Structures are given as structure tokens and as C-alpha cells.
Ligand code: HEM
Ligand code: HEM
């Protein structure tokens with residue numbers, strides 16, 4: 001009977017109703033006529049009502065809803081907008097909003113960790129050199145010699161008629177992709193453009209499969225400046241397999257720290273164009289997507305040849321078998337090197353726990369089924385059997401187009 | 405207006421224009437996507453669905469606007485106006501059936517859509533006759549292992565009476581027997597239907613792979629029980645190409661996947677019993693049927709045979725055993741010479757189908773969550789392909805269990 005989306009788990013037969021989706025103040029790309037759930041990108045008074053709503057969220061979370069401190073903050077916000085066209089978050093409001101944005105992110109399977117996020121405030125930053133210092137500090141804290149810690153650094157918000165703080169790299173740590181004489185790519189094909197941009201801005205490039213890119217950092221109304229990360233700060237894990245002795249001879253490696261640098265963090269209508277955040281990897285990200293996507297490192301055939309598989313027919317399941325060993329290699333190598341990582345089984349189990357916590361706390365959890373289900377062994381994980389409702393809540397992270 | 409659809413592996417983009425032909429709303433709204441939900445919960449109407457469908461039929465034979473087209477629209481007007489309903493010509497039924505398959509967004513096997521044997525069983529008046537028709541279908545579709553797609557269409561729904569229904573969800577299914585210890589012997593998905601069969605007089609077996617009888621219901625009658633002749637149900641014992649102990653697990657599956665509980669809708673008419681069959685994609689058996697925790701749940705058994713470390717998720721014992729179970733399914737079907745398709749072959753052919761449908765109709769409705777296989781998703785090309793989901797008619801439609 002409840003007038004809210006009914007949500008079922010088909011493994012366990014259990015039912016919930018999502019009431020949180022009523023809080024959503026932003027349309028996705030679906031209509032009654034057609035579902036667009038699988039698209040990667042969907043394409044004055046406004047600020048105030050967004051600001052008012054965020055402040056209500058803040059005072060709810062500290063249980064001071066309706067208090068005069070709440071009403072005074074409301075009054076203080078609209079008087080700021082009244083005279084400057086914008087307003088500013090208090091420190092504890094920023095901390096709240098950043099965690100809430102992570103909590104609200106439908107595509108993230110790691111949200112059980114949402115309440116544990118180090119928020120570095122960098123809203124004082126005023127140069128690209130200073131952005132560099134801030135980022136190096138973030139990487140150091142976040143990496144913590146392999147005992148990885150979730151973190152976000154928040155640079156100054158968009159200002160009317162002032163250029164943006166931007167990190168040009170899509171991640172803080174990524175490998176170069178060098179377009180070759182014969183059309184092929186050495187390194188990571190995903191990163192051909194950013195690699196070419198780094199060179200155009202004066203970077204002397206390497207010639208390897210795994211060259212850490214430098215950072216391209218843009219302070220307001222200036223050309224971006226180039227910064228090389230000192231190698232001692234970028235922790236990497238050489239890949240070996242627990243029983244296949246030859247795997248180490250492949251010279252494969254990956255970096256410890258997954259750190260998104262190109263997303264817009266929106267809080268109460270305010271927009272933080274540079275606010276890089278980092279966690280730790282789920283092993284499928286490296287072992288399945290990064291290493292096996294045809295349009296990435298594409299190592300599946302090489303590994304299956306080493307494994308002596310029949311690569312000439314689909315029904316030998318050579319792709320499936322090779323992908324499994326590569327994944328096991330990612331896990332074993334990170335474990336050996338004492339770098340935090342989580343396999344897709346533990347990650348999804350922990351996300352089911354998170355669904356249950358959020359059901360109690362907020363009456364639902366926005367989630368993108370296609371992104372939550374891992375790219376190998378999907379139905380072997382509990383999330384495969386769990387219906388999910390997807391909607392946009394704010395605070396939010398947002399994809400933003402490349403600044404070039 | 406028209407959604408951009410992108411393949412992320414290849415960089416190629418199409419636009420879906422077919423979706424403007426959808427007449428029926430799905431579960432999503434701009435506020436929230438419900439695309440992952442398995443089921444979401446007069447004469448003038450029927451006349452326009454009928455006109456539209458007849459328009460589709462004559463268009464498909466390139467006789468659009470001809471005398472036979474106009475006179476067939478008149479026939480339908482006249483029949484509906486006098487009786488509240490009408491009847492399809494056999495060739496139109498044939499067209500409608502193929503098109504309902506074509507339009508099925510959860511089906512990865514649609515490259516085959518133009519090749520479907522259609523049995524007209526609309527002259528059925530008893531559970532007995534239904535049983536005979538079902539037996540011909542099975543024998544025909546099975547064809548000693550060289551499987552052939554088929555559908556049998558029983559009499560349509562009528563305003564003045566109950567439905568023809570097949571109580572079973574599939575024609576061939578294994579029994580599930582609830583035990584004293586609250587565990588299940590056989591297939592846990594079929595405990596309820598096994599219990600109905602027993603209640604309607606079936607003497608039950610006691611194995612893990614006991615083929616269920618059929619419960620067939622003619623209008624307003626109690627369902628009747630019919631045992632499938634064991635020589636008609638082709639089965640495949642499962643063994644592994646290199647792991648010799650696998651055969652000892654005594655595992656087996658049936659050759660013929662035949663859905664018997666869906667409703668076929670054509671030109672506004674509803675066929676409540678219209679069982680259809682193709683051939684298996686190996687992951688349905690290897691991954692879902694055998695490995696789902698609420699199914700035969702054999703993963704831990706196999707992984708232990710393979711001597712894997714089960715104590716820890718990080719050894720990827722589940723992933724290892726799942727692949728070997730799938731391989732055993734493929735090998736066993738190929739050895740027994742029964743048609744089967746692996747998920748790589750199937751999804752590659754589906755990509756081709758998307759390309760064909762783009763040229764033919766300017767799109768293809770597809771449910772990404774159902775099209776992407778349950779193991780090795782991103783290792784298939786469909787993972788990287790955006791898809792657009794919507795309801796076209798003719799259609800297969802889910803219907804609730806008759807009891
Ligand atoms: C703590 C360990 C974490 C794990 C294991 C984790 C896991 C994941 C995974 C597997 C994805 C899908 C990525 C892909 O397929 O490319 C993802 C996406 C995402 N994660 Fe988490 N995450 C973690 C921490 C964080 C943190 C600290 C934040 C932000 C504060 C975050 C926010 C996001 C966002 C916004 C996305 C969507 C990215 C996009 O749309 O490109 N995650 N995460
Ligand atoms: C010829 C070989 C065929 C293959 C390889 C194939 C493959 C598949 C697969 C893998 C699924 C999803 C099954 C699941 O996860 O439960 C499916 C669903 C479906 N198939 Fe096909 N199929 C074939 C033939 C047919 C035929 C002949 C029809 C009807 C004439 C058909 C209509 C459907 C429908 C309506 C669904 C959705 C069923 C539901 O919602 O329960 N398929 N198919």
C-alpha cells in the first residue's frame with residue numbers, strides 16, 4: 001500500500017520502501033516513456049532555496065532543527081546573498097556537506113565508510129603552487145605508507161566573474177599514454193589527451209607503460225601550471241601472482257591511491273570546482289577494468305597465452321579464466337605490499353550492510369545498480385539480487401566537462 | 405527528445421528514434437530511476453491497438469494502403485463493434501509472435517528473432533488438448549539436440565470467462581521438496597509448484613533433478629495434471645573437460661528452456677498461455693541455476709573439490725569455481741551435441757543485432773541489467789554499450805501465478 005517505490009531483495013525475499021527519494025530536488029534522465037539508467041552521462045532565488053535547504057540539513061544532523069541558532073544562520077545566509085550574490089560555509093558545515101556528498105553518491109560501493117572522511121579545508125588557497133602543496137599534503141596523509149585513509153581537499157568555490165580553481169587531471173595519480181608511430185598506444189589509452197596536454201605545457205615525457213603523469217593545476221584566470229609529483233610520494237604496487245611464477249615477469253604495476261580530481265562538489269548551491277577526493281581501491285577496478293578493458297591496457301590475451309589457454313574460441317572461457325587470475329594477482333600483490341585494498345565480495349557485502357543502515361537512518365539509499373554490481377562475478381555478489389532506486393540528492397559530486 | 409546512445413569501448417554514437425513508438429509507460433520518472441526493478445506494480449482502446457497492429461502487419465509485407473489492408477481494417481472494425489473483440493489471421497499471429505520476441509528488452513538472443521516456428525493452438529478446448537500441443541512443441545523444439553525456437557499459442561482471453569493457463573513457469577523444471585530440517589531437496593525455486601503438483605495427485609520422486617509434471621488449466625476448470633513422457637525431456641549430464649571428479653557430483657540440466665507463464669499481447673488481444681522456447685546461454689545454468697545461493701547453491705561444494713581456500717573471500721574461490729562450473733556446462737552440452745551458446749558468443753551476436761535494428765527501425769529497446777551476463781560482465785561488449793529501455797507492442801508481459 002505505501003505510496004513510495006517498493007524495493008525487493010530477490011535472494012532473501014525481503015522488502016523495503018524508499019521514502020528518501022521524495023527529498024530529491026533534481027531530475028535524472030528517465031521518463032515514464034523510456035529508461036536511460038545505463039547512460040554514463042546524463043546532460044538569485046535559486047541559490048537561496050538551495051542554501052536554505054542545505055542549512056536545514058545541517059541543523060537536522062546536529063538535532064537543532066527549529067532553534068534560534070538555526071534561524072539566525074538562515075538569516076545570516078540570506079543577508080549574505082542579499083548583498084554579495086553568494087555566501088560562505090562555516091567550517092563544520094563544509095565537513096558535513098562533503099560527507100553528505102559522498103553518502104549521496106549513487107555510483108559508489110564504498111559508502112559504508114562515509115562517516116570517516118578527513119576533510120582538509122583549503123578555501124584559503126590562492127595560487128597554483130599552493131594548490132600543489134595542498135595536493136602533496138593530501139597524498140601523503142591519504143597514502144599513510146599504505147594504510148590508506150579516505151580524504152578530500154576543498155579549494156575555493158566558484159565566484160561570480162572570477163575564473164575557477166581547476167585540476168586538469170581526472171585523477172591525482174594516473175599513467176601516461178603515448179600515441180605511437182603505428183597508431184597504437186604505449187601506456188594507458190585513456191590518458192592520451194592529458195598526456196599530450198602535459199607535453200604541450202612543457203613536460204619531458206617518458207617512454208614507459210607506467211609513467212606517472214604530472215599535475216596540471218589552474219588557479220583563477222591563469223593558464224594552468226605544471227607540477228611533477230616527487231616519486232617518493234606516489235606509492236606503487238608491483239604485480240605478482242601467488243602461484244603463477246611467470247606473472248611477475250610481465251612487469252605489471254598499479255598505484256595505491258585512487259583519487260578523483262575532476263569532479264564538482266556542490267553544497268547548498270555553492271560550487272567547488274576543485275575538490276579532489278580519495279579512498280582505497282576495490283580490486284576489480286584495477287584487475288578487471290584498468291588492466292582488461294579492450295580500450296585500456298588490454299592484457300587478457302597476453303595473460304591467457306601465458307596460461308596456455310585456447311584463445312581461438314570463445315567457449316574455452318579463456319577470457320573469464322585469465323581475468324580471474326589477474327584479479328587474484330591484484331589482491332595478493334596489494335596484500336603482500338601491505339596496501340589497503342578490498343575484493344569485490346567484501347565490498348559488496350559491506351554495501352548491503354550500508355543499505356540496511358541507511359534504510360533505518362534515512363528511509364532509503366540512492367544507488368546505480370549498473371555501477372554497484374562489479375564487472376566480474378556479478379551474480380556471485382549479494383548486490384546483484386538487490387533492487388535499487390537511483391535519484392540525485394544534494395550535497396552531490398558532479399561530473400564536469402574537461403576545462404580545455 | 406531523442407536519446408543519444410554511446411558505446412564506450414568504441415566511441416561510436418547512435419540516436420534512438422524507435423522509442424517514440426512506445427505507447428505504454430514503464431516504472432521510471434524524472435525524480436527516480438526504477439530500471440533495476442524485476443517487476444514494477446473499452447472498444448475504442450482495443451480498436452486503436454488493433455488498427456495500429458494491422459498497420460504494422462501490412463507495412464511488414466510491404467502492402468501498406470492496399471485493398472487487402474483496407475478491407476482487413478474494416479473486418480476488424482466490424483468484428484469489434486459487434487462483439488467487443490476480434491480474431492487474428494494465422495499469418496498475423498505469426499508476425500505478432502516474432503515481433504513480441506523482437507521487442508523483448510531482457511532477451512540477449514534476439515539476433516534469432518526472424519526464425520521462430522509458430523504453432524497455432526487456438527483450436528484448443530481442453531487441458532488434454534493443451535497437453536498434446538505442449539508435447540508436439542517439446543518434441544519439435546528439442547529435435548534430438550539441434551534446438552529450434554518455437555512458440556505455441558493457446559486460445560486468447562475472452563471477456564466472458566477464465567483463462568487458459570499453464571501453471572508451471574517453464575515447461576521443464578526440477579522439483580523442490582521441503583524437508584523436515586527446513587532445507588530443500590532439488591530446486592528451491594520450485595517448492596511451491598512442487599507442492600501444488602503433489603496436492604493435485606502427483607506421486608513425487610525424491611531426487612534433486614526430478615522433472616515436474618504439468619498443471620494445465622482450461623477456462624474455469626481446476627487445473628489437470630500431466631506427466632511429461634521421460635523420452636521427450638532431453639537432459640545433459642554435466643562433466644568437466646579436465647576435472648574428472650566433477651562428473652561424480654551427479655549434476656545435470658535440461659536441454660530446453662521453455663517459458664510457460666508469460667502473456668503474449670498482440671493488437672490488444674491477450675494470449676494467457678503461449679509457451680515459447682529457444683536454447684540456453686550457458687551462464688543461465690552454470691551461474692544462476694547452479695550457483696545462486698537460493699538455487700542449487702553448489703559453489704562451495706565445487707570449490708572444496710578443487711581444494712581451494714574457502715576461509716577467505718580474497719582467494720577468489722567463488723570466482724574460480726563459478727568459471728569451472730560454466731566451462732563444465734559448455735563442454736557437457738557440446739559433448740552431448742545439444743545447442744548452447746556461451747555468453748561471449750551471445751553478446752557479440754547481440755551487438756550485431758543492435759546494429760541491424762538501428763538500420764531497420766532506428767533503435768532497439770534493451771534492459772542493460774538483464775543483457776549483461778552474470779559473470780564476466782565487462783569482458784563482454786554489451787557492458788560498454790549504453791541502452792535505452794521501453795515497451796513496444798506486440799509484447800511478452802509478466803503475469804501473476806494463477807493460484
Ligand atoms: C573508502 C574506499 C572506497 C571505495 C572502495 C570506493 C569504491 C568505488 C568504486 C568501485 C567506484 C566505481 C568506480 C569506477 O568503476 O570507475 C566508486 C565511485 C565513486 N566514488 Fe567511491 N570508493 C571509496 C571511497 C570514496 C570516497 C572517499 C569518495 C568521496 C569522498 C567516493 C566517491 C565516489 C564517487 C563520487 C564515485 C562516482 C565517480 C564517477 O562518477 O566517476 N568514494 N567508488
Ligand atoms: C534462440 C535462443 C535464445 C537465447 C540464447 C535466449 C537468451 C535469453 C536470456 C539469457 C534471457 C535472460 C534469462 C534469465 O536471466 O532468466 C532471455 C530472456 C527472455 N527471452 Fe530469450 N533467448 C532465446 C530465445 C527466445 C525466444 C524464442 C523467445 C520468445 C519467442 C524469447 C523471449 C524472451 C523473453 C520474453 C525474455 C524475458 C523473460 C522474462 O522476463 O522472464 N527468447 N533470453
Ligand SMILES: Cc1cc(N)nc(CCc2cncc(CCc3cc(C)cc(N)n3)c2)c1
Pocket residue numbers: 040041258259260277278279280281282285399
Ligand atoms: C565520462 C565519465 C563520467 C563519470 N561520471 N566518471 C568518469 C570516470 C570514472 C572513473 C574512472 N576511473 C577511476 C575513477 C575513480 C574511482 C574511485 C574513486 C575513489 C575515491 C575510490 C575508488 N576505489 N575508486 C572513476 C567518466
Ligand SMILES: Cc1cc(N)nc(CCc2cncc(CCc3cc(C)cc(N)n3)c2)c1
Pocket residue numbers: 442443513574661662663680681682683684685688802
Ligand atoms: C519474478 C519474475 C519476473 C520475470 N519477468 N521473470 C521471471 C523468471 C525469469 C526466468 C527464470 N528462469 C528461466 C527463464 C527462461 C529464460 C530463457 C528463455 C528462453 C526462451 C531462452 C533462454 N535461453 N532462456 C526465465 C521471474
Ligand SMILES: C[C@H](O)[C@H](O)[C@H]1CNc2nc(N)[nH]c(=O)c2N1
Pocket residue numbers: 038039040370371372412787788789790791
Ligand atoms: C554503458 C554502461 O553504463 C557503462 O559501461 C558502465 C556500466 N557500469 C559501470 N560500473 C562501474 N562501476 N564503472 C563503470 O565505468 C561502468 N561502466
Ligand SMILES: C[C@H](O)[C@H](O)[C@H]1CNc2nc(N)[nH]c(=O)c2N1
Pocket residue numbers: 010384385386387388440441442773774775
Ligand atoms: C535486482 C536485479 O534487477 C535482478 O537480480 C536481475 C539482475 N539481472 C538479471 N539478468 C538476467 N539475465 N536475469 C536475471 O534474473 C536478472 N536478475
Ligand SMILES: [Zn+2]
Pocket residue numbers: 030034035036037432436437438439
Ligand atoms: Zn530508469
